[PDB]
PDB file of C-alpha atoms in Angstrom:
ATOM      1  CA  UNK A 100     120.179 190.430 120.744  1.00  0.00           C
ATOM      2  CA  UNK A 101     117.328 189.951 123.406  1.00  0.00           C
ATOM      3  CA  UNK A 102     114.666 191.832 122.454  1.00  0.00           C
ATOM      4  CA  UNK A 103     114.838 189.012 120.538  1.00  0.00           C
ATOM      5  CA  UNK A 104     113.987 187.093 123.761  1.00  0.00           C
ATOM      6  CA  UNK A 105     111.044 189.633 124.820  1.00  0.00           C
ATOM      7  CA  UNK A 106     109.579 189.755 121.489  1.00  0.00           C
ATOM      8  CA  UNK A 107     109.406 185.844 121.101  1.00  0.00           C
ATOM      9  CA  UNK A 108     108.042 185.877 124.502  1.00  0.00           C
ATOM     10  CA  UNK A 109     105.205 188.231 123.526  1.00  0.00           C
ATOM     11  CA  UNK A 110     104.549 186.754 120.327  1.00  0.00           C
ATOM     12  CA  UNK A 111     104.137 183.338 121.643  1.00  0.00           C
ATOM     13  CA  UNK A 112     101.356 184.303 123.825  1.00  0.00           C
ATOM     14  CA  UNK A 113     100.174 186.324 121.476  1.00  0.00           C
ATOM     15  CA  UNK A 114      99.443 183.453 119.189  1.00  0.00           C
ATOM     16  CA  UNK A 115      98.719 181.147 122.376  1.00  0.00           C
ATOM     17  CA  UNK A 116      95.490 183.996 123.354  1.00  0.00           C
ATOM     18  CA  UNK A 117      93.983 182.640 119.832  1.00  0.00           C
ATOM     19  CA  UNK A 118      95.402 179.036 119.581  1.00  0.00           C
ATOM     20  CA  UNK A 119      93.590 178.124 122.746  1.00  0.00           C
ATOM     21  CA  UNK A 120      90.219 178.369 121.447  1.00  0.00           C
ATOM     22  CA  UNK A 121      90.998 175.816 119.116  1.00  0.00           C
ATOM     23  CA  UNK A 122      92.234 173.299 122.242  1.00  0.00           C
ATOM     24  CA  UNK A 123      96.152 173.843 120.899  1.00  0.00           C
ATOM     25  CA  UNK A 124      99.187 175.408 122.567  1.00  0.00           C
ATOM     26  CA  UNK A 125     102.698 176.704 121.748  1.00  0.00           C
ATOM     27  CA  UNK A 126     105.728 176.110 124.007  1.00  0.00           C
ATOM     28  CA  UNK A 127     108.738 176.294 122.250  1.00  0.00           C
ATOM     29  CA  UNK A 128     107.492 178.731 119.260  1.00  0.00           C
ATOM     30  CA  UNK A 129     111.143 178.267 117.242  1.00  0.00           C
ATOM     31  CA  UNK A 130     110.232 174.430 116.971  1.00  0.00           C
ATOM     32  CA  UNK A 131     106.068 173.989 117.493  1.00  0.00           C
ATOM     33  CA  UNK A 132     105.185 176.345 114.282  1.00  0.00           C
ATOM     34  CA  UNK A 133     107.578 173.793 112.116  1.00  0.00           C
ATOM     35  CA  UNK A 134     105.306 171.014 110.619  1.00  0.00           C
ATOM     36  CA  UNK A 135     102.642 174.038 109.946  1.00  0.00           C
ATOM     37  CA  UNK A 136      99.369 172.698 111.988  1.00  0.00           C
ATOM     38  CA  UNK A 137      99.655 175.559 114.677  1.00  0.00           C
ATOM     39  CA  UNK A 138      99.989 177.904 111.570  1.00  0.00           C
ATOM     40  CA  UNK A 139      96.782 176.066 109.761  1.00  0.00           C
ATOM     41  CA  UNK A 140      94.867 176.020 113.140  1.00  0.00           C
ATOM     42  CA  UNK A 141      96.134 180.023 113.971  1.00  0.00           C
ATOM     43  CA  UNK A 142      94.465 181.106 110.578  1.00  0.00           C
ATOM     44  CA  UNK A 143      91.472 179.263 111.162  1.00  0.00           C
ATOM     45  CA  UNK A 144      90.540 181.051 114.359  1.00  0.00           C
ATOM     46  CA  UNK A 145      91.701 184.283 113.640  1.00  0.00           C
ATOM     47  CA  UNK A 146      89.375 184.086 110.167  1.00  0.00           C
ATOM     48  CA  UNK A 147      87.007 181.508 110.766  1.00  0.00           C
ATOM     49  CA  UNK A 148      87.499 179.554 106.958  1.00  0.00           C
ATOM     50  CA  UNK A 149      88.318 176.362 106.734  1.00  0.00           C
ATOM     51  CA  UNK A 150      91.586 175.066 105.247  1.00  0.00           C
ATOM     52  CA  UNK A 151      93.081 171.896 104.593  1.00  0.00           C
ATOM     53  CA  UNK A 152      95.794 169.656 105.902  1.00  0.00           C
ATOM     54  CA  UNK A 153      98.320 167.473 105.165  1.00  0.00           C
ATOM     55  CA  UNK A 154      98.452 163.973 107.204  1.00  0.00           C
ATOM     56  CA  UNK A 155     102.354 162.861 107.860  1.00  0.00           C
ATOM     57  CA  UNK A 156     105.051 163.024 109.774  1.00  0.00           C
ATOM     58  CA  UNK A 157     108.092 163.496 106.666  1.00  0.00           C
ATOM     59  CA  UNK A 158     109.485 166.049 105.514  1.00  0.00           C
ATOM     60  CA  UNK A 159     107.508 166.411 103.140  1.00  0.00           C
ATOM     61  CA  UNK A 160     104.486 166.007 104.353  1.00  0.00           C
ATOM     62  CA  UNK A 161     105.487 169.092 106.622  1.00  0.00           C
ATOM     63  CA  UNK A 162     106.337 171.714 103.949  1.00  0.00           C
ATOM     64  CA  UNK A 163     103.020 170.968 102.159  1.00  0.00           C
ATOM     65  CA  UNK A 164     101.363 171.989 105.281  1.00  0.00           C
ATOM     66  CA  UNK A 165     103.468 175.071 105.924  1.00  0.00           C
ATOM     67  CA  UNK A 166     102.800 175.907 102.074  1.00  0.00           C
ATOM     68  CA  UNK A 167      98.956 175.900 102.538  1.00  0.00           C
ATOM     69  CA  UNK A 168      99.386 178.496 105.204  1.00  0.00           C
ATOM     70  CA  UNK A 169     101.739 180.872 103.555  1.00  0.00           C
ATOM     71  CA  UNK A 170      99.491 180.646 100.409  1.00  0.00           C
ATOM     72  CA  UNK A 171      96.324 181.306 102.121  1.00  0.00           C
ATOM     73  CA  UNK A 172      98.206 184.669 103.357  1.00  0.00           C
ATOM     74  CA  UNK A 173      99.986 185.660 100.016  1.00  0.00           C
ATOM     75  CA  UNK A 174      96.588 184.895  98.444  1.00  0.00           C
ATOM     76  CA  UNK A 175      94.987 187.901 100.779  1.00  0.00           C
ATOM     77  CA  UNK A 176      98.056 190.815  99.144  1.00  0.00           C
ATOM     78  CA  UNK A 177     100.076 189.911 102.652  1.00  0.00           C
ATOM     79  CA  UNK A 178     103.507 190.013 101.373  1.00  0.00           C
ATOM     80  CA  UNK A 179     105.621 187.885 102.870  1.00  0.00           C
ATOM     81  CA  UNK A 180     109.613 189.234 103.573  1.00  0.00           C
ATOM     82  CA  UNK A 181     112.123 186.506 102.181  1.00  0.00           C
ATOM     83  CA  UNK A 182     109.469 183.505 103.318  1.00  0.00           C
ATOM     84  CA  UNK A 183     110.177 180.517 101.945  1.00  0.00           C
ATOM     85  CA  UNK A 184     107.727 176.918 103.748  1.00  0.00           C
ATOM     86  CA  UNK A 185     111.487 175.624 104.584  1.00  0.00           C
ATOM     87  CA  UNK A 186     112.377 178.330 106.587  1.00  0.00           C
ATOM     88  CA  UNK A 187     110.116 177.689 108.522  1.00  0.00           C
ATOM     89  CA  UNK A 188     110.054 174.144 108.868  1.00  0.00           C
ATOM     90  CA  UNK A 189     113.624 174.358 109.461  1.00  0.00           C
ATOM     91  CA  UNK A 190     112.757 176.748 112.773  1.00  0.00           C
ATOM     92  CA  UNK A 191     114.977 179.960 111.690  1.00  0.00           C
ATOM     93  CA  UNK A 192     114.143 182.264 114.478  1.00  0.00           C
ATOM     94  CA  UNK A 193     114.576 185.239 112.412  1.00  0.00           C
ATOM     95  CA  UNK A 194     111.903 184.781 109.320  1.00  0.00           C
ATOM     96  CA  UNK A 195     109.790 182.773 111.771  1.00  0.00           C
ATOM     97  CA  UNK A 196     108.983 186.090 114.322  1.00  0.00           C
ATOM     98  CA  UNK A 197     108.734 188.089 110.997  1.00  0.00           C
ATOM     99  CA  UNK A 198     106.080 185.533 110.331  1.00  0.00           C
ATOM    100  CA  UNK A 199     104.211 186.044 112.918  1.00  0.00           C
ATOM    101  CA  UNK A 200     104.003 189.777 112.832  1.00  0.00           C
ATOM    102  CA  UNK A 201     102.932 189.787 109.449  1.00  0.00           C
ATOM    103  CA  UNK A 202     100.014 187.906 110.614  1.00  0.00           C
ATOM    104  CA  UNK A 203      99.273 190.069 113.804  1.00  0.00           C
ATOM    105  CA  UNK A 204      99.656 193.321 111.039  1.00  0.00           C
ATOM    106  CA  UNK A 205      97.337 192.107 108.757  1.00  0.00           C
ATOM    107  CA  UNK A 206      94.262 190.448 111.294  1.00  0.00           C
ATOM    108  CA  UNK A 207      94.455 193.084 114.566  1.00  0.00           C
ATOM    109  CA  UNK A 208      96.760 196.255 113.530  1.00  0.00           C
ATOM    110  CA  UNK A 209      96.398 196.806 109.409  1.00  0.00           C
ATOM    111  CA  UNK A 210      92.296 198.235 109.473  1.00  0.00           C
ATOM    112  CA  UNK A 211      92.598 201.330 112.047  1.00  0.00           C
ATOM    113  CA  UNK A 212      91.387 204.679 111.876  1.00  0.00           C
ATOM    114  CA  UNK A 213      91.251 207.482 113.717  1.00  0.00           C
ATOM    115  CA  UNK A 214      89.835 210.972 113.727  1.00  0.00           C
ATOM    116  CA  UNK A 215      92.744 213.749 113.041  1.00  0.00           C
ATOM    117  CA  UNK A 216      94.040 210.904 110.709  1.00  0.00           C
ATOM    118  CA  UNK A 217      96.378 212.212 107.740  1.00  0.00           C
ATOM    119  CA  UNK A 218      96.033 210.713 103.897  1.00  0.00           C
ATOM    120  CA  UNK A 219      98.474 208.506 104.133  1.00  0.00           C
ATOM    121  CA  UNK A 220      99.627 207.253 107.612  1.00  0.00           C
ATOM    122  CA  UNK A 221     100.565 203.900 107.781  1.00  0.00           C
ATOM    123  CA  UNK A 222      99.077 201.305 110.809  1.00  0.00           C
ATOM    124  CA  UNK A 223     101.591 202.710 113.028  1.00  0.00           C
ATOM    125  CA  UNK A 224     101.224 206.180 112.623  1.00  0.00           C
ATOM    126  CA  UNK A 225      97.443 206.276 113.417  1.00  0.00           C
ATOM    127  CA  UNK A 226      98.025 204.004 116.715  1.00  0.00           C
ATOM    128  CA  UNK A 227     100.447 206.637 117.754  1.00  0.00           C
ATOM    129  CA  UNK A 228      98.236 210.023 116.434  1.00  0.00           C
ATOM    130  CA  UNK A 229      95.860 207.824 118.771  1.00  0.00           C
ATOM    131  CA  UNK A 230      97.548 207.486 122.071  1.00  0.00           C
ATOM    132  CA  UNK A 231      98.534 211.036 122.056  1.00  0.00           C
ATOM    133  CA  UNK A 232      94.686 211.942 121.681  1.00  0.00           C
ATOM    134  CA  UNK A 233      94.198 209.685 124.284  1.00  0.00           C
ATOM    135  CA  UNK A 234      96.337 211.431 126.600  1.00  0.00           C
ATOM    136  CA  UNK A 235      96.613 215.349 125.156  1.00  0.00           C
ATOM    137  CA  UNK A 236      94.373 215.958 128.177  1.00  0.00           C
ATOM    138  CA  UNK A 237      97.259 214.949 130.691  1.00  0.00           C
ATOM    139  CA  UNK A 238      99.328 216.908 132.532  1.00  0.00           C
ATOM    140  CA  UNK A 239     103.003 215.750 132.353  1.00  0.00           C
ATOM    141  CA  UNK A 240     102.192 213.256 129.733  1.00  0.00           C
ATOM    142  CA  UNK A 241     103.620 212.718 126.053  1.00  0.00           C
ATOM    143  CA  UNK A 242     103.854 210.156 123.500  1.00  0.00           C
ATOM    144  CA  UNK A 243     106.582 210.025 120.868  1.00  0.00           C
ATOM    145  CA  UNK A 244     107.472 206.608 120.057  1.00  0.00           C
ATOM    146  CA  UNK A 245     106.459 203.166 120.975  1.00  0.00           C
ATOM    147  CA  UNK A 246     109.674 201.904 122.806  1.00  0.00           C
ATOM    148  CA  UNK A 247     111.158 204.972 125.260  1.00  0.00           C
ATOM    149  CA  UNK A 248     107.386 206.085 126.096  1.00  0.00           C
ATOM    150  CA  UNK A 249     105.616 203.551 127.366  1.00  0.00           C
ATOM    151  CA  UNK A 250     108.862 202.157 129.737  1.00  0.00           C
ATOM    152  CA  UNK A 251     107.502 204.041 133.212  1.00  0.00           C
ATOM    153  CA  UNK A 252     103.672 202.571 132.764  1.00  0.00           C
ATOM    154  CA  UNK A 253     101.906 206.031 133.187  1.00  0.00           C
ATOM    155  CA  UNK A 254     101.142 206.033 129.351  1.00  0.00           C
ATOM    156  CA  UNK A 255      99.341 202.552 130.037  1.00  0.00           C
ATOM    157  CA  UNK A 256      97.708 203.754 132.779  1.00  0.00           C
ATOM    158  CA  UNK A 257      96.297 207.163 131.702  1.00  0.00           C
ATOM    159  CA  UNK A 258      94.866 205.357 128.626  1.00  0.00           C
ATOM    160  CA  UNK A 259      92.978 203.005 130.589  1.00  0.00           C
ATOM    161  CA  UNK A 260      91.695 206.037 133.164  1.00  0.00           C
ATOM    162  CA  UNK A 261      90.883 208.146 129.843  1.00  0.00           C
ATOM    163  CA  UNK A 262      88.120 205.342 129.103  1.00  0.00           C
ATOM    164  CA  UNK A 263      86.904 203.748 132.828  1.00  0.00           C
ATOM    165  CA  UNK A 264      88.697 206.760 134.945  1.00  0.00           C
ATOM    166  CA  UNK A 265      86.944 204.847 137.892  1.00  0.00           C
ATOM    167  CA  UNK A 266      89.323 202.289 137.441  1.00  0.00           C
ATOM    168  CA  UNK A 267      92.292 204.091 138.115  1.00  0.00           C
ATOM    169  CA  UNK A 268      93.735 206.185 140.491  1.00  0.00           C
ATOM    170  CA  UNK A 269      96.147 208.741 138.684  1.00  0.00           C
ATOM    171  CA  UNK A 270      98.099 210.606 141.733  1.00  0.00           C
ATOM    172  CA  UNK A 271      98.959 207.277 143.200  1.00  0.00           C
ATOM    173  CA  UNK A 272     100.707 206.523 139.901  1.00  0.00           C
ATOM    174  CA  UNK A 273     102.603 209.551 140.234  1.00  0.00           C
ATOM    175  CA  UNK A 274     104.034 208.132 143.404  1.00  0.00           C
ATOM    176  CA  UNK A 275     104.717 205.359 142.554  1.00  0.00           C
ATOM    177  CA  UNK A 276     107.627 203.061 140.831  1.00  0.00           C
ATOM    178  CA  UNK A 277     107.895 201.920 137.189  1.00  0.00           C
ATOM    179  CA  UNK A 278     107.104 198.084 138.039  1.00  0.00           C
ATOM    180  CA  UNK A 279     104.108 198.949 140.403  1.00  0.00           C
ATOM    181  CA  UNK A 280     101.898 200.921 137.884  1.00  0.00           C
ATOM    182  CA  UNK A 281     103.401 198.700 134.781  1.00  0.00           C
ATOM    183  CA  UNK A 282     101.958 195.562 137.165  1.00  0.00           C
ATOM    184  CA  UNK A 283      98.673 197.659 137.753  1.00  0.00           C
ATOM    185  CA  UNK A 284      97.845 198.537 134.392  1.00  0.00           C
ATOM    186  CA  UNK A 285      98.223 194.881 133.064  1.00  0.00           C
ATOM    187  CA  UNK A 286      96.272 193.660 135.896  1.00  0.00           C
ATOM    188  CA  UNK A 287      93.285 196.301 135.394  1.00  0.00           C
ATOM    189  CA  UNK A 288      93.198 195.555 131.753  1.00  0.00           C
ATOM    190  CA  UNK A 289      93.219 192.422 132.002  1.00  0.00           C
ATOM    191  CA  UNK A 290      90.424 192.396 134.561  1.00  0.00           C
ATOM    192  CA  UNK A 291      88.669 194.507 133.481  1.00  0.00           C
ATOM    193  CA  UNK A 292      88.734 195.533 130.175  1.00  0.00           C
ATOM    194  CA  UNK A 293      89.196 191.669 128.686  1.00  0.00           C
ATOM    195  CA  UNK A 294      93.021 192.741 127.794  1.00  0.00           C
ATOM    196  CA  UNK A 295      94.985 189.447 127.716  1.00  0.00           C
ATOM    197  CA  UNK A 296      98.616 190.135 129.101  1.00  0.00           C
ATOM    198  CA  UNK A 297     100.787 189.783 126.372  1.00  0.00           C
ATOM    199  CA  UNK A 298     104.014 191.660 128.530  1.00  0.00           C
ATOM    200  CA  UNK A 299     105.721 190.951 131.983  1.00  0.00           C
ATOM    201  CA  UNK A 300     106.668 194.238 133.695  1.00  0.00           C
ATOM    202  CA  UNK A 301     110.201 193.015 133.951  1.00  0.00           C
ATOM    203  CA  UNK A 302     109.986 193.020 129.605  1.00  0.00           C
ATOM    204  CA  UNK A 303     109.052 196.821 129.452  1.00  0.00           C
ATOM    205  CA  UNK A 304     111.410 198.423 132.315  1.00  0.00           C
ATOM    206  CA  UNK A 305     114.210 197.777 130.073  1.00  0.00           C
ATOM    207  CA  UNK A 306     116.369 200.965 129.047  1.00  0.00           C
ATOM    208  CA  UNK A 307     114.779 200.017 125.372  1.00  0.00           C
ATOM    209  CA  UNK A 308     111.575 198.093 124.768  1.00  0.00           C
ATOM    210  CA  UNK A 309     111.009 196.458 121.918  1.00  0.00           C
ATOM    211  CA  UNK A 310     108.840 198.065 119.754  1.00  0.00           C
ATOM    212  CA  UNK A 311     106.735 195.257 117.990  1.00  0.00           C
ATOM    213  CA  UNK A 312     106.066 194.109 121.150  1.00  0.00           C
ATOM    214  CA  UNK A 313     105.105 197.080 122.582  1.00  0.00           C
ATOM    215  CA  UNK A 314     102.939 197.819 119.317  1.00  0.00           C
ATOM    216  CA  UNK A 315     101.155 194.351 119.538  1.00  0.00           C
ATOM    217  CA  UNK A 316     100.113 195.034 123.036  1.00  0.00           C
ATOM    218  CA  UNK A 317      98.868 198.906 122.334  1.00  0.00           C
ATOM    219  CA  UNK A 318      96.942 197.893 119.516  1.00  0.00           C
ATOM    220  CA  UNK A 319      95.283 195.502 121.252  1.00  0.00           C
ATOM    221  CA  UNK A 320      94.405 198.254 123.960  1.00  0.00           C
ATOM    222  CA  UNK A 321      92.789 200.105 121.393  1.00  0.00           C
ATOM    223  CA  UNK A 322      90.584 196.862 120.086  1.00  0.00           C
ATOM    224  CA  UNK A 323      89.791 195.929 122.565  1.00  0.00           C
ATOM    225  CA  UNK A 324      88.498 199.862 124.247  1.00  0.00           C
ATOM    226  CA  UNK A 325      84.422 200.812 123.729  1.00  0.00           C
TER     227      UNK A 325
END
C-alpha cells in the first residue's frame, strides 16, 4: 500500500534533516540504513554520545554494527517491535520504517506536555489535546484525528497564525485551494519558523494521509513553536 510510499518519503528526510549535520545522506532508505553506520551516525547527532563502530565490509561485520545501534536503544527502555540486526541488514521495508519511528517517538514526540493534559494520555493524545487548543479560537475549525484533518492545510495554517498571526493571512486561505495554502504553510514554516519540510503538498491532498507522517511533521510544529 502507498502510504507506504509517503511515509518512507517523509521518514527519509526526516532522518536526512539530522544526518546532514554529521556530513552523511540517505537516498535509498530500504538499502543505505543496512550495514548500520547511518543508524550509528543518526544516534550520535540526535544524542550527542559517542558510540562505536565496526570496520568491514562482510556480513558480519555489518550486523555487529546494526547490533550496537539497536542495543544502545533497547538499553534506553525503547522497545523494539519484532527487531532483529538482520532485518535490517537484510533491508525489510516493513520493520525498517517501524525502526525509524521508534526512534523519532522516543528523541522528538515521547517528552510532551501540555496544559488541560489528562493522567494518562499517551504522546499522541497530548499533540492532538494541543492542536485543538491551538485552534479552539477559530471559527470553522476542528481537529479530530491526524490523517482526515489536516488534508485541506487550514489546520497548518491557523497554527502557524495562532503563534506569528503576522505571518499569515487567514481569509485568503479561506479562498483558496487545498494545494495553495498546504504549499504556503510549508513554505512559511519553513522560512520562518526554522520548520524543515518533511511533506510535499501532493503527499497530504490524498483522500487519506498517513498518519505517522502527518504526526512526525505536527510534532515537529510544536518543537519547534516559542
Amino acid at each position: 500500500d502507498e502510504r507506504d510510499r509517503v511515509q518512507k518519503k517523509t521518514f527519509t528526510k526526516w532522518v536526512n534533516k539530522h544526518l546532514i549535520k554529521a556530513q552523511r545522506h540517505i537516498s535509498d532508505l530500504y538499502e543505505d540504513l543496512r550495514d548500520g553506520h547511518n543508524l550509528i551516525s543518526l544516534l550520535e547527532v540526535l544524542s550527542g554520545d559517542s558510540l562505536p563502530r565496526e570496520k568491514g565490509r562482510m556480513r558480519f561485520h555489518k550486523l555487529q554494527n546494526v547490533q550496537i545501534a539497536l542495543d544502545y536503544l533497547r538499553h534506553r527502555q525503547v522497545k523494539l517491535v519484532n527487531i532483529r540486526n538482520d532485518d535490517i541488514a537484510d533491508g525489510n521495508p516493513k520493520l525498517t520504517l517501524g525502526l525509524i519511528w521508534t526512534i523519532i517517538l522516543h528523541f522528538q514526540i515521547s517528552d510532551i506536555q501540555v496544559s488541560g493534559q489528562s493522567e494518562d494520555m499517551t504522546a499522541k493524545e497530548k499533540l492532538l489535546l494541543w492542536s485543538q487548543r491551538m485552534v479552539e479560537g477559530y471559527q470553522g475549525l476542528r481537529c479530530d484525528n491526524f490523517t482526515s484533518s489536516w488534508r485541506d492545510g487550514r489546520l497548518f495554517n491557523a497554527i502557524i497564525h495562532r503563534h506569528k498571526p503576522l505571518l499569515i493571512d487567514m481569509n485568503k486561505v479561506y479562498r483558496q485551494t487545498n494545494l495553495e495554502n498546504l504549499d504556503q504553510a510549508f513554505s512559511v514554516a519553513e522560512r520562518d519558523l526554522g520548520v524543515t519540510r518533511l511533506l510535499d503538498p501532493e503527499d497530504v491532498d490524498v483522500p487519506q494521509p498517513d498518519e505517522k507522517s502527518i504526526i512526525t511533521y505536527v510534532s515537529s510544529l510544536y518543537d519547534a513553536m516559542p
